[PDB]
Symmetry: C3
Subunit: 149 residues, 3 copies
C-alpha cells in the first residue's frame, strides 16, 4: 500500500503539473500571446508606479519594458492610454535604468524629454503616440505587466 500510493501520488502530481502548464498556455493564447513574443497584459487600472511594480511582482511578471520599436508599439496597443514603463532614474537623476537592471538601450523619448519637470520626474510613461515622457512616480497611469516570450 504505502509505497504504491506514494508512487501513484507522484504520478498524480506530475499529471496536475502538466494540466496547469496547459491551462497557462491556453490562457496566454486567449490573452493574445504571439509565438516567440513576450506578452503584455493590463486590467486597465491606473495607479502609482510603486503599485504597478507590486502588482506585476505578485503576478510574477514585471512592469512593461519595450526593448525595441516593435515591443514599444505592442505596449502602446495594450495600454490604449498613458502607461508606466519599467524604467526610472530614481537611483541617479538623469540616468534611466530598467527596473530589471541596466542602462537603457532603446528609447523613444518625446522631444526635450526626459526633463525632470518641476518638482521632479523619475518615472516614465509611454503616451498615446508611442513616444515617452518622464513623469512623477506618484502620478496614476495604466498598469501594464510583462511576461516572457
Amino acid at each position: 500500500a504505502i509505497e504504491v500510493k506514494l508512487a501513484n501520488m507522484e504520478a498524480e502530481i506530475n499529471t496536475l503539473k502538466s494540466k496547469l502548464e496547459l491551462t497557462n498556455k491556453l490562457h496566454a493564447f486567449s490573452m493574445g500571446k504571439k509565438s516567440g513574443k513576450k506578452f503584455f497584459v493590463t486590467n486597465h487600472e491606473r495607479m502609482p508606479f510603486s503599485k504597478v511594480k507590486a502588482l506585476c511582482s505578485e503576478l510574477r511578471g514585471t512592469v512593461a519594458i519595450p526593448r525595441n520599436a516593435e515591443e514599444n508599439k505592442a505596449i502602446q496597443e495594450v495600454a490604449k492610454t498613458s502607461a508606466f514603463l519599467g524604467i526610472t532614474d530614481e537611483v541617479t537623476e538623469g540616468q534611466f535604468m530598467y527596473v530589471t537592471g541596466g542602462r537603457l538601450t532603446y528609447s523613444n523619448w518625446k522631444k526635450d524629454e526626459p526633463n525632470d519637470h518641476g518638482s521632479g520626474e523619475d518615472c516614465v510613461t509611454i503616451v498615446d503616440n508611442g513616444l515617452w515622457n518622464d513623469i512623477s512616480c506618484q502620478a496614476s497611469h495604466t498598469a501594464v505587466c510583462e511576461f516572457p516570450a
Copy 2:
C-alpha cells in the same frame, strides 16, 4: 527514503497550490479585475434567472449584485445588455432581497419601477443607462457573475 519522498511531495503540492492561485490572479487581472474591487464577468449568454444562479454557483461565484453606484456601473459595462442581478422579492412583494441574504440597500430603479407588471415580476435586470427593472424570473437575460474583491 519514504519520509523524505513524502516531505518532498508535500513541498511540490504547496508549490502547485501557489502556482494555481497565481493563475487565478493573472486571469482576473487580464479580464479587468481592479484592485480591491469585486470581479465581474460574463460569457454574454442570456438565460432564465434559475440558470444564471446555477451557473455562477457552479463557478463558485454568485449572480452580480451592485452594492453602490460604482459597482452598478462596473456591472453595466461588463454586461453591455439587460442582465439579471442577484436580487428578488419572491418572499415579500416589494421587499427585494439579495440572493446571498439581507435587505436591499442601494437601488437604481427606472421610472415606474418596480411595478411587478402583468402576472408578476420578482427578479431584477440592469438595463439601459444602468437603470433597474423588475422582470419575470422566467425571462432570459445576460448572465453576469461576481467574484470577491
Copy 3:
C-alpha cells in the same frame, strides 16, 4: 504517522484537481463559451495551416470547425479576419474531410469555390461575410481553435 500524511496528501491533490477544473470552467466562461456549446479562441496570430494544427493540438483542441450556421457565425466573430478551418482535401483531392475525421457535411462556400486554384488548394479559410474559400495550406491565416462543448 506516515499513513495520516499520505491520506492528507490524497485530499490535497483531490482538492487541487477540483479547483483546477473550476479555474478551467471560469476561463472558458470568461472567453465566451455558451452552455452546451463548444467555444472558439484565437490569439489573432496568422500562420501556415500545419502550425495552427500543431498549436490547437497542443492545447487539446483542434482547428475551428463550423458544423452549422451558428458555429460559423461564432467563428467569424472570433476570427475578425480570414482564418483556417479544420477542413481539408489533402488526402483525396476534391473530398474535403474534417481534420478529426469524416466527410464534410455542412458547408458555406463562396460562389465558385472550392476550386483547387492554380498549383492547388487543399486547405480552407472562413473569409468575407463568413463564406469559405479553399486556399494553400502554406498560406498564413488566423489561428482559431475550438474546444469541446
